[PDB]
Amino acid sequence: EYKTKVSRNSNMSKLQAGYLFPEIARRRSAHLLKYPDAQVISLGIGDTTEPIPEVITSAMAKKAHELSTIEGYSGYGAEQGAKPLRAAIAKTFYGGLGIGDDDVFVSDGAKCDISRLQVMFGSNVTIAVQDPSYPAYVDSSVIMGQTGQFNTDVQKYGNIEYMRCTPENGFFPDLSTVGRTDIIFFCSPNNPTGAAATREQLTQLVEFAKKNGSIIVYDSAYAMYMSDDNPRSIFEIPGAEEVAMETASFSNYAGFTGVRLGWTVIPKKLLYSDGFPVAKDFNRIICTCFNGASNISQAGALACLTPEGLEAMHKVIGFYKENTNIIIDTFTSLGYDVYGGKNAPYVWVHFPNQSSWDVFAEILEKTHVVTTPGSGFGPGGEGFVRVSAFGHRENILEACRRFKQLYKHHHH
Amino acid sequence: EYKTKVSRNSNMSKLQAGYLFPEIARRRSAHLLKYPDAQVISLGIGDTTEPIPEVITSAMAKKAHELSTIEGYSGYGAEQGAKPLRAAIAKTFYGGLGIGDDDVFVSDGAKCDISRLQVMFGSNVTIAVQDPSYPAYVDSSVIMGQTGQFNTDVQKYGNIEYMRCTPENGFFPDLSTVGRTDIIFFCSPNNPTGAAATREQLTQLVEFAKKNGSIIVYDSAYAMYMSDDNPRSIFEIPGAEEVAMETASFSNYAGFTGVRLGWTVIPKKLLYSDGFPVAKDFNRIICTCFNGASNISQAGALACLTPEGLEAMHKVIGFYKENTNIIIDTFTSLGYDVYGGKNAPYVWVHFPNQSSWDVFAEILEKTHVVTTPGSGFGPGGEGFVRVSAFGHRENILEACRRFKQLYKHH
Ligand SMILES: Cc1ncc(COP(=O)(O)O)c(/C=N/[C@@H](CCC(=O)O)C(=O)O)c1O
Ligand SMILES: Cc1ncc(COP(=O)(O)O)c(/C=N/[C@@H](CCC(=O)O)C(=O)O)c1O
């Protein structure tokens, strides 16, 4: 066979396996070959399942129809997003926090922004992540050349600061033990643990970033699930404007997982070591490497940020929070240590003295329920399994019945 | 003022100015501050202007409504795109060319794929581009660290092979003069020259890539504007499957510039030097750095690839081709050397003894028409101006009247 003379990107070669969620899909498929009649319930990937509220879909359909009219047609949008949408995001989520319309960048989702931010930061920054954490932070870092090779002894890529979050530290890093890095990716409520940082903890985080001269990338994709009285935006912490940016999404709020609409906020006071504003480089990236979020998706997001849209999202979120409570109650009654669930639409179940991949496999094999093994979120996730609360009510209830039957004999 | 201790990405520092099209928009905005009541006609950025056909928008509206129902709701899609859409693209544009549904990757547009491909290739590849060419190829290369600094003497970033395309050579490079690189970005029809490579020229290009062990990134964003009997896909050239991939979009075909939907095709026989299939690394990038094109946009694209959708696109394309002829005739009658327009919805006009930014500024100040300075497309673009044919018919006619009035006595 013919081969080119182009060398494979050595950063791609560093990756240990495929992306976590496609790997789970492969195991789900293999399971269906083994059990063709199985009624599989997926509580693995956090994919929303309930319909989008009509007030929001109606706005998207209206935009689509408008595109067939002379007056209503629009072509390229400014890559930063429609001004009324930037304004609505700035006021709804950041009113009172000194965030301007021009600080908001509308995306086709948080996953995509994480990687565009990584292109922006480039190959020479070092990063810290919560351990465990959403795997895209680590994987994007490896792809960009910010890491060394994977070390199989410790299950870590070289040169990443993995900040261990455990039951014993309340799922917040012991910052006095964390080495200095350029970037700190910090998710609150955390995926997969569900832990929401308190005001005191976020204050510590901002102080740590300030002393170390680091940039915090704060992922607030589940913040509207907050039940405890904790900050929902990093910008609630005075000084955050000098060290932090925030990335978020409509995926988990309106069921926009397939529609694609998020945003990133970069404040004016966030500067590189030479005084250059970080937002100006992000603006160059989003103008050069992106051509804007879908106009229909932007119209849907604008409709979300109205009294009727907010009411609708609140109902969607409330439904998933009720699913979460059903799952928490099930595992608690089974005698498990169950974490998260309070501030996030998933639960983090402790399966000590087992491999999380083994637990994943056992649950799938015996109950036909897909979960996510904790080790998929980094070595700090070993010993845990994440169970998503996204599902139709009957599917949640059925999965819990199956869990109760599987684990009935494990505890008194 | 507080500053972090994070060093700015040195690749961002390399960029000589802002991205071309936002800079044009800034100048347009400045013009409207100067003259608030100016009736500005925008022929700079290639932004489509005519409505999307109803058959296509109806499909998008239907998908939106379906998302509010239990049965019709869908969440995350496959990051590669819906299988029926991949199948429709594969058969419609590549039927008979040995392209499978799994070779197609649905994107939110060609600009985005160019940059995701560049993340995939990484910092250690060298690139070649046509000179002039669409500026994203060069700027994405700089951002990814594949280049040196901008050299102001020659108006080139270091370590990029700029392939000279001129009226004299029919805007196809003399490949005997082109140095070996890892990647060759090649646009046909080319933006901004409008030049469509002939079958013979593409055969040369494929042979050149094969000898050099290079990967061609073929951008076919304007291929449906082809009037001459030239290949529309690189895969029409036997052997392309070993050396080429193709990126395209619905932007210029259905007016999806704001809707966002394109694709890339990476064939099975395209391998790195270690035998690793390039498509497998692209798949990892689109699974890790992307979450799929919008489900509504995918539904729109699926409706495009039907008899009614193709008919509707053909009509829109035809309208813009008519606009292009109006523009060609205007500049030709004024005595300018005008290139392109035959196979693409823009014209490439030669303005001797003048910088293209000065011509841009003069045209905007005097006629309130926005154009694109040729130098924005690389050093080979100096002395030229691109005029887009995307516009309402009355605006094209008005712009041409303004050009004639300005230039007829000179
Ligand atoms: C902390 C966090 N940040 C970003 C994302 C991606 O959100 P979008 O790209 O806007 O849908 C997600 C979504 N995570 C899901 C979906 C998986 C994925 O996006 O790869 C999960 O962990 O199952 C997330 O949890
Ligand atoms: C050769 C070529 N390749 C890709 C694109 C971008 O297409 P999409 O991102 O799918 O809308 C374009 C679009 N160019 C326009 C819009 C400018 C831009 O995309 O930045 C222009 O040249 O005016 C292009 O010309």
Tab-separated table of N, CA and C in Angstrom, chain A residues 1-6 8-9 12 15 17-19 46-52 57 61 64-65 67-70 73 75-76 79 108 111-112 115 119-122 139 143 180 182 210-211 213 242 255 257-260 271-273 275-276 281 284-285 287-292 294-295, chain B residues 1-6 8-9 12 15 17-19 46-54 57 61 64-65 67-69 73 75-76 79 108 111-112 115 119-122 139 143 180 182 210 213 242-243 255 257-260 271-273 276 281 284-285 287-292 294-295 297:
chain	number	residue	atom	x	y	z
A	1	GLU	N	0.840	-1.226	0.000
A	1	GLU	CA	0.000	0.000	0.000
A	1	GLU	C	0.863	1.259	0.000
A	2	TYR	N	0.372	2.282	-0.692
A	2	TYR	CA	1.008	3.589	-0.694
A	2	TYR	C	0.806	4.262	0.669
A	3	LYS	N	1.846	4.936	1.141
A	3	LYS	CA	1.750	5.781	2.334
A	3	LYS	C	2.358	7.134	2.004
A	4	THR	N	1.803	8.211	2.575
A	4	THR	CA	2.423	9.521	2.410
A	4	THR	C	3.732	9.576	3.204
A	5	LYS	N	4.454	10.683	3.068
A	5	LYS	CA	5.665	10.908	3.860
A	5	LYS	C	5.389	11.884	5.003
A	6	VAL	N	4.112	12.065	5.328
A	6	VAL	CA	3.748	12.958	6.422
A	6	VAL	C	3.756	12.186	7.724
A	8	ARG	N	2.675	11.276	11.345
A	8	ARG	CA	1.549	11.388	12.251
A	8	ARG	C	1.882	12.394	13.348
A	9	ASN	N	0.888	13.175	13.739
A	9	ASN	CA	1.069	14.123	14.833
A	9	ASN	C	1.454	13.357	16.095
A	12	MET	N	-1.081	13.126	18.906
A	12	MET	CA	-2.137	12.131	18.738
A	12	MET	C	-1.664	10.743	19.181
A	15	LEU	N	-2.063	9.671	23.004
A	15	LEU	CA	-3.344	9.291	23.590
A	15	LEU	C	-3.418	7.791	23.833
A	17	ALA	N	-6.071	5.747	24.492
A	17	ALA	CA	-7.199	5.032	23.956
A	17	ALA	C	-8.067	6.060	23.257
A	18	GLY	N	-9.207	5.618	22.745
A	18	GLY	CA	-10.184	6.531	22.177
A	18	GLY	C	-10.845	7.345	23.274
A	19	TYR	N	-11.601	8.359	22.862
A	19	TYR	CA	-12.361	9.181	23.806
A	19	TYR	C	-13.314	8.296	24.595
A	46	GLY	N	-24.042	11.812	29.661
A	46	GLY	CA	-25.069	12.714	30.172
A	46	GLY	C	-25.854	13.321	29.035
A	47	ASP	N	-26.658	12.495	28.376
A	47	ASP	CA	-27.440	12.970	27.248
A	47	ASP	C	-28.859	13.226	27.703
A	48	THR	N	-29.345	14.434	27.443
A	48	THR	CA	-30.698	14.809	27.836
A	48	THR	C	-31.693	13.954	27.049
A	49	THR	N	-32.853	13.697	27.658
A	49	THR	CA	-33.836	12.784	27.085
A	49	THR	C	-35.234	13.371	26.889
A	50	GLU	N	-35.558	14.432	27.627
A	50	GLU	CA	-36.907	15.000	27.560
A	50	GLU	C	-36.979	16.059	26.461
A	51	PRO	N	-38.170	16.263	25.881
A	51	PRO	CA	-38.306	17.215	24.785
A	51	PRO	C	-37.914	18.645	25.173
A	52	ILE	N	-37.502	19.419	24.179
A	52	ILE	CA	-37.257	20.847	24.381
A	52	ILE	C	-38.611	21.548	24.551
A	57	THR	N	-38.589	25.736	21.059
A	57	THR	CA	-38.617	25.193	19.693
A	57	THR	C	-39.415	26.085	18.751
A	61	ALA	N	-38.210	27.344	15.111
A	61	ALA	CA	-39.003	27.173	13.898
A	61	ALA	C	-39.319	28.521	13.246
A	64	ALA	N	-36.302	29.647	11.406
A	64	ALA	CA	-36.165	28.872	10.181
A	64	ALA	C	-37.076	29.425	9.091
A	65	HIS	N	-38.338	29.679	9.433
A	65	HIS	CA	-39.263	30.254	8.456
A	65	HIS	C	-38.799	31.618	7.963
A	67	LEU	N	-35.898	32.647	7.566
A	67	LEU	CA	-34.773	32.521	6.638
A	67	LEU	C	-35.212	32.333	5.179
A	68	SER	N	-36.494	32.023	4.981
A	68	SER	CA	-37.074	31.892	3.642
A	68	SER	C	-37.699	33.179	3.120
A	69	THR	N	-37.577	34.256	3.892
A	69	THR	CA	-38.111	35.556	3.492
A	69	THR	C	-36.986	36.563	3.240
A	70	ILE	N	-37.256	37.553	2.390
A	70	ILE	CA	-36.250	38.558	2.062
A	70	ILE	C	-35.836	39.325	3.311
A	73	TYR	N	-34.147	36.875	6.162
A	73	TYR	CA	-32.913	36.155	5.879
A	73	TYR	C	-31.708	36.832	6.545
A	75	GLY	N	-27.273	35.964	6.820
A	75	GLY	CA	-26.153	35.113	6.403
A	75	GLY	C	-25.163	34.945	7.536
A	76	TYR	N	-23.884	35.208	7.267
A	76	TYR	CA	-22.889	35.143	8.329
A	76	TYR	C	-23.292	36.033	9.481
A	79	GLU	N	-18.844	36.327	14.469
A	79	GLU	CA	-18.421	35.074	15.086
A	79	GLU	C	-18.607	35.043	16.604
A	108	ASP	N	-20.907	27.026	19.665
A	108	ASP	CA	-21.738	25.856	19.420
A	108	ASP	C	-21.532	24.797	20.510
A	111	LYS	N	-17.884	21.964	24.940
A	111	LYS	CA	-16.812	21.065	24.506
A	111	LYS	C	-15.950	21.742	23.432
A	112	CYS	N	-16.609	22.420	22.497
A	112	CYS	CA	-15.898	23.085	21.409
A	112	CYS	C	-15.090	24.272	21.920
A	115	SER	N	-11.742	23.208	23.524
A	115	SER	CA	-10.669	22.988	22.563
A	115	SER	C	-10.191	24.259	21.854
A	119	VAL	N	-6.389	25.705	21.813
A	119	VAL	CA	-5.650	26.227	20.646
A	119	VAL	C	-5.070	27.614	20.978
A	120	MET	N	-5.898	28.442	21.605
A	120	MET	CA	-5.499	29.794	21.984
A	120	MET	C	-4.328	29.784	22.959
A	121	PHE	N	-4.415	28.967	24.007
A	121	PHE	CA	-3.340	28.928	25.021
A	121	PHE	C	-2.071	28.355	24.409
A	122	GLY	N	-2.253	27.355	23.553
A	122	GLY	CA	-1.124	26.795	22.821
A	122	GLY	C	-0.366	25.690	23.534
A	139	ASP	N	-7.661	15.404	27.593
A	139	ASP	CA	-7.433	14.939	26.226
A	139	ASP	C	-7.058	16.094	25.297
A	143	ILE	N	-3.594	16.552	23.096
A	143	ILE	CA	-3.651	16.867	21.659
A	143	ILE	C	-2.860	18.129	21.313
A	180	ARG	N	2.230	24.755	40.941
A	180	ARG	CA	1.879	25.848	40.052
A	180	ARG	C	1.777	25.366	38.615
A	182	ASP	N	0.084	26.963	34.558
A	182	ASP	CA	-0.464	28.135	33.877
A	182	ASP	C	-1.971	28.203	33.951
A	210	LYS	N	-4.275	33.837	41.902
A	210	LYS	CA	-3.648	35.151	41.953
A	210	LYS	C	-2.192	35.034	42.382
A	211	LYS	N	-1.936	34.237	43.416
A	211	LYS	CA	-0.564	34.100	43.904
A	211	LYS	C	0.331	33.404	42.877
A	213	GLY	N	-0.235	33.336	39.612
A	213	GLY	CA	-0.337	33.977	38.296
A	213	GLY	C	-0.911	33.012	37.270
A	242	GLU	N	-9.550	39.153	37.320
A	242	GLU	CA	-8.120	39.236	37.017
A	242	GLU	C	-7.477	37.873	36.720
A	255	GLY	N	-31.955	21.066	26.987
A	255	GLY	CA	-31.881	19.859	26.143
A	255	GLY	C	-31.214	20.129	24.802
A	257	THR	N	-28.355	19.480	23.721
A	257	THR	CA	-27.208	18.610	23.428
A	257	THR	C	-27.008	18.392	21.933
A	258	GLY	N	-28.113	18.309	21.196
A	258	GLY	CA	-28.062	18.175	19.740
A	258	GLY	C	-28.200	19.477	18.978
A	259	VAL	N	-28.713	20.519	19.638
A	259	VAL	CA	-28.950	21.808	18.988
A	259	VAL	C	-27.670	22.641	18.884
A	260	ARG	N	-26.846	22.587	19.938
A	260	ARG	CA	-25.504	23.178	19.977
A	260	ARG	C	-25.492	24.684	20.232
A	271	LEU	N	-5.301	39.284	31.873
A	271	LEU	CA	-4.143	39.617	31.040
A	271	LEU	C	-3.047	38.579	31.115
A	272	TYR	N	-2.381	38.381	29.980
A	272	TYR	CA	-1.160	37.596	29.935
A	272	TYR	C	-0.023	38.336	30.631
A	273	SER	N	1.109	37.645	30.791
A	273	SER	CA	2.230	38.197	31.559
A	273	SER	C	2.808	39.467	30.956
A	275	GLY	N	0.905	41.776	29.624
A	275	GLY	CA	-0.169	42.761	29.650
A	275	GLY	C	-1.219	42.607	28.560
A	276	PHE	N	-1.006	41.666	27.642
A	276	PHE	CA	-1.940	41.487	26.534
A	276	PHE	C	-3.245	40.849	27.017
A	281	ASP	N	-7.025	37.569	22.136
A	281	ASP	CA	-6.559	36.365	21.447
A	281	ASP	C	-7.702	35.381	21.236
A	284	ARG	N	-9.500	36.502	18.224
A	284	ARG	CA	-8.813	36.114	16.987
A	284	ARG	C	-9.094	34.645	16.663
A	285	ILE	N	-9.021	33.771	17.667
A	285	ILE	CA	-9.340	32.355	17.442
A	285	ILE	C	-10.766	32.161	16.917
A	287	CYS	N	-12.666	34.165	15.352
A	287	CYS	CA	-12.848	34.796	14.031
A	287	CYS	C	-12.129	34.023	12.927
A	288	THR	N	-11.153	33.203	13.305
A	288	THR	CA	-10.273	32.545	12.330
A	288	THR	C	-10.576	31.061	12.202
A	289	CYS	N	-10.957	30.457	13.321
A	289	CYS	CA	-11.135	29.010	13.416
A	289	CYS	C	-12.598	28.590	13.541
A	290	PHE	N	-13.509	29.552	13.451
A	290	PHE	CA	-14.937	29.324	13.732
A	290	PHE	C	-15.699	30.338	12.890
A	291	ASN	N	-16.943	30.014	12.530
A	291	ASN	CA	-17.764	30.943	11.754
A	291	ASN	C	-19.094	31.246	12.420
A	292	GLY	N	-19.154	31.028	13.734
A	292	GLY	CA	-20.318	31.433	14.528
A	292	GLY	C	-21.217	30.250	14.819
A	294	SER	N	-24.866	28.346	15.047
A	294	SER	CA	-25.993	28.331	14.124
A	294	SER	C	-26.991	29.442	14.456
A	295	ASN	N	-27.462	30.158	13.432
A	295	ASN	CA	-28.428	31.241	13.665
A	295	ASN	C	-29.736	30.764	14.288
B	1	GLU	N	-2.149	47.693	37.513
B	1	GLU	CA	-3.025	46.580	37.037
B	1	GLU	C	-2.358	45.229	37.237
B	2	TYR	N	-3.166	44.261	37.631
B	2	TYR	CA	-2.694	42.907	37.819
B	2	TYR	C	-2.557	42.213	36.458
B	3	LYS	N	-1.496	41.425	36.313
B	3	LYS	CA	-1.325	40.543	35.157
B	3	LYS	C	-1.017	39.156	35.688
B	4	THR	N	-1.474	38.131	34.973
B	4	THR	CA	-1.087	36.756	35.302
B	4	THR	C	0.388	36.518	34.967
B	5	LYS	N	0.876	35.317	35.262
B	5	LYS	CA	2.235	34.929	34.863
B	5	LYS	C	2.173	33.959	33.687
B	6	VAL	N	1.033	33.926	32.999
B	6	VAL	CA	0.884	33.032	31.847
B	6	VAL	C	1.422	33.730	30.609
B	8	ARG	N	1.730	34.652	26.890
B	8	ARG	CA	0.897	34.646	25.690
B	8	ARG	C	1.440	33.630	24.694
B	9	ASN	N	0.537	32.909	24.040
B	9	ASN	CA	0.927	31.962	22.988
B	9	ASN	C	1.744	32.690	21.918
B	12	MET	N	0.207	33.240	18.507
B	12	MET	CA	-0.756	34.325	18.337
B	12	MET	C	-0.045	35.638	18.060
B	15	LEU	N	0.903	36.603	14.307
B	15	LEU	CA	-0.080	37.083	13.351
B	15	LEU	C	0.100	38.573	13.123
B	17	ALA	N	-1.828	40.937	11.656
B	17	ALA	CA	-2.962	41.816	11.920
B	17	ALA	C	-4.145	40.932	12.275
B	18	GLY	N	-5.320	41.536	12.433
B	18	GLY	CA	-6.548	40.773	12.634
B	18	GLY	C	-6.912	39.979	11.389
B	19	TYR	N	-7.878	39.082	11.545
B	19	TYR	CA	-8.363	38.303	10.418
B	19	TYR	C	-8.984	39.259	9.397
B	46	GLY	N	-17.885	37.325	1.287
B	46	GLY	CA	-18.763	36.560	0.420
B	46	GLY	C	-19.944	36.046	1.200
B	47	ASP	N	-20.836	36.957	1.573
B	47	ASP	CA	-21.979	36.593	2.383
B	47	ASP	C	-23.188	36.486	1.476
B	48	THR	N	-23.837	35.331	1.510
B	48	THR	CA	-25.031	35.108	0.702
B	48	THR	C	-26.139	36.071	1.148
B	49	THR	N	-27.051	36.394	0.230
B	49	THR	CA	-28.032	37.442	0.489
B	49	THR	C	-29.467	37.021	0.227
B	50	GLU	N	-29.645	35.989	-0.598
B	50	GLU	CA	-30.986	35.572	-1.000
B	50	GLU	C	-31.533	34.557	-0.008
B	51	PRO	N	-32.867	34.525	0.178
B	51	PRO	CA	-33.467	33.614	1.155
B	51	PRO	C	-33.119	32.151	0.886
B	52	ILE	N	-33.152	31.356	1.941
B	52	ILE	CA	-33.034	29.908	1.793
B	52	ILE	C	-34.340	29.363	1.209
B	53	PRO	N	-34.243	28.450	0.232
B	53	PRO	CA	-35.460	27.872	-0.321
B	53	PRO	C	-36.383	27.271	0.743
B	54	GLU	N	-37.683	27.477	0.555
B	54	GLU	CA	-38.693	26.981	1.488
B	54	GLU	C	-38.642	25.470	1.746
B	57	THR	N	-35.939	25.274	4.446
B	57	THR	CA	-36.316	25.831	5.751
B	57	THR	C	-37.480	25.075	6.381
B	61	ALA	N	-37.647	23.775	10.174
B	61	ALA	CA	-38.771	24.058	11.074
B	61	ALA	C	-39.421	22.778	11.580
B	64	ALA	N	-37.262	21.335	14.284
B	64	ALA	CA	-37.427	22.123	15.509
B	64	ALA	C	-38.702	21.702	16.239
B	65	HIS	N	-39.813	21.596	15.507
B	65	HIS	CA	-41.075	21.174	16.125
B	65	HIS	C	-40.977	19.767	16.696
B	67	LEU	N	-38.494	18.354	17.976
B	67	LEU	CA	-37.723	18.366	19.217
B	67	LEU	C	-38.570	18.661	20.455
B	68	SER	N	-39.790	19.170	20.259
B	68	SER	CA	-40.711	19.388	21.382
B	68	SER	C	-41.637	18.191	21.641
B	69	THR	N	-41.398	17.077	20.948
B	69	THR	CA	-42.214	15.870	21.129
B	69	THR	C	-41.384	14.721	21.693
B	73	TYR	N	-37.817	13.984	19.782
B	73	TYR	CA	-36.651	14.553	20.455
B	73	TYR	C	-35.395	13.717	20.208
B	75	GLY	N	-31.004	14.030	21.294
B	75	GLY	CA	-29.973	14.755	22.045
B	75	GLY	C	-28.675	14.785	21.270
B	76	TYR	N	-27.592	14.346	21.905
B	76	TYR	CA	-26.307	14.291	21.209
B	76	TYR	C	-26.465	13.465	19.948
B	79	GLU	N	-20.891	12.505	16.485
B	79	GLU	CA	-20.026	13.645	16.106
B	79	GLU	C	-19.657	13.691	14.623
B	108	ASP	N	-19.850	21.880	11.240
B	108	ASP	CA	-20.571	23.143	11.241
B	108	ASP	C	-19.922	24.144	10.278
B	111	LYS	N	-14.751	26.404	7.319
B	111	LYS	CA	-13.747	27.160	8.074
B	111	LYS	C	-13.356	26.401	9.340
B	112	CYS	N	-14.351	25.821	9.999
B	112	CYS	CA	-14.133	25.083	11.235
B	112	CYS	C	-13.354	23.805	10.984
B	115	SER	N	-9.563	24.423	10.548
B	115	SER	CA	-8.830	24.522	11.799
B	115	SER	C	-8.759	23.217	12.581
B	119	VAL	N	-5.351	21.328	13.813
B	119	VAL	CA	-5.089	20.732	15.129
B	119	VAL	C	-4.637	19.274	14.964
B	120	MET	N	-5.314	18.550	14.077
B	120	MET	CA	-4.972	17.148	13.821
B	120	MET	C	-3.560	17.002	13.257
B	121	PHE	N	-3.235	17.770	12.214
B	121	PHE	CA	-1.900	17.688	11.614
B	121	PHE	C	-0.839	18.082	12.633
B	122	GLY	N	-1.152	19.099	13.433
B	122	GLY	CA	-0.229	19.534	14.479
B	122	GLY	C	0.857	20.499	14.032
B	139	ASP	N	-3.548	31.558	8.131
B	139	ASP	CA	-3.679	32.008	9.522
B	139	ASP	C	-3.783	30.826	10.489
B	143	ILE	N	-1.271	29.974	13.622
B	143	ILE	CA	-1.811	29.697	14.957
B	143	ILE	C	-1.315	28.363	15.510
B	180	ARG	N	8.875	20.979	-1.741
B	180	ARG	CA	8.140	19.935	-1.023
B	180	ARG	C	7.646	20.415	0.343
B	182	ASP	N	4.612	19.059	3.641
B	182	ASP	CA	3.732	17.980	4.073
B	182	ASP	C	2.314	18.132	3.545
B	210	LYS	N	1.936	12.766	-4.850
B	210	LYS	CA	2.343	11.375	-4.693
B	210	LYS	C	3.871	11.257	-4.649
B	213	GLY	N	5.025	12.716	-1.411
B	213	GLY	CA	4.445	12.123	-0.199
B	213	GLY	C	3.692	13.155	0.627
B	242	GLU	N	-5.098	8.278	-2.296
B	242	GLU	CA	-3.876	7.978	-1.553
B	242	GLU	C	-3.211	9.237	-1.015
B	243	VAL	N	-3.653	10.407	-1.484
B	243	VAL	CA	-2.957	11.649	-1.165
B	243	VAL	C	-3.843	12.834	-0.807
B	255	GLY	N	-27.220	29.002	0.988
B	255	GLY	CA	-27.261	30.217	1.819
B	255	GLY	C	-27.126	29.899	3.294
B	257	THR	N	-24.639	30.173	5.208
B	257	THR	CA	-23.558	30.924	5.864
B	257	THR	C	-23.825	31.155	7.363
B	258	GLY	N	-25.091	31.354	7.714
B	258	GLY	CA	-25.481	31.515	9.112
B	258	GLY	C	-26.027	30.270	9.780
B	259	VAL	N	-26.444	29.288	8.972
B	259	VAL	CA	-27.046	28.050	9.489
B	259	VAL	C	-25.990	27.063	9.977
B	260	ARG	N	-24.877	27.010	9.242
B	260	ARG	CA	-23.664	26.258	9.589
B	260	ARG	C	-23.741	24.755	9.311
B	271	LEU	N	-2.856	7.573	4.281
B	271	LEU	CA	-2.098	7.076	5.429
B	271	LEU	C	-0.918	7.971	5.734
B	272	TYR	N	-0.627	8.119	7.018
B	272	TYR	CA	0.616	8.730	7.455
B	272	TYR	C	1.805	7.821	7.125
B	273	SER	N	3.015	8.331	7.330
B	273	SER	CA	4.218	7.588	6.936
B	273	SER	C	4.422	6.299	7.743
B	276	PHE	N	-0.517	4.744	9.574
B	276	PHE	CA	-1.724	5.043	10.342
B	276	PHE	C	-2.721	5.825	9.487
B	281	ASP	N	-7.335	9.579	13.053
B	281	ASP	CA	-6.970	10.725	13.890
B	281	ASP	C	-7.987	11.854	13.762
B	284	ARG	N	-10.787	11.018	16.046
B	284	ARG	CA	-10.477	11.339	17.446
B	284	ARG	C	-10.652	12.835	17.710
B	285	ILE	N	-10.169	13.680	16.801
B	285	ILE	CA	-10.361	15.132	16.959
B	285	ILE	C	-11.841	15.515	17.003
B	287	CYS	N	-14.360	13.746	17.875
B	287	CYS	CA	-14.997	13.183	19.074
B	287	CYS	C	-14.569	13.907	20.349
B	288	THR	N	-13.407	14.556	20.313
B	288	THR	CA	-12.821	15.154	21.505
B	288	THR	C	-12.999	16.673	21.550
B	289	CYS	N	-12.951	17.299	20.373
B	289	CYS	CA	-12.930	18.758	20.261
B	289	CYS	C	-14.218	19.348	19.688
B	290	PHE	N	-15.208	18.501	19.439
B	290	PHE	CA	-16.428	18.900	18.734
B	290	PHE	C	-17.550	18.024	19.279
B	291	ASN	N	-18.783	18.520	19.211
B	291	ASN	CA	-19.933	17.719	19.632
B	291	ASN	C	-20.990	17.574	18.549
B	292	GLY	N	-20.584	17.791	17.307
B	292	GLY	CA	-21.458	17.565	16.158
B	292	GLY	C	-22.081	18.845	15.633
B	294	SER	N	-25.271	21.115	14.356
B	294	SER	CA	-26.614	21.257	14.902
B	294	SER	C	-27.560	20.277	14.233
B	295	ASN	N	-28.400	19.627	15.035
B	295	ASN	CA	-29.390	18.689	14.503
B	295	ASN	C	-30.362	19.322	13.510
B	297	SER	N	-29.592	21.994	11.610
B	297	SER	CA	-28.797	22.238	10.405
B	297	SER	C	-28.630	20.948	9.596
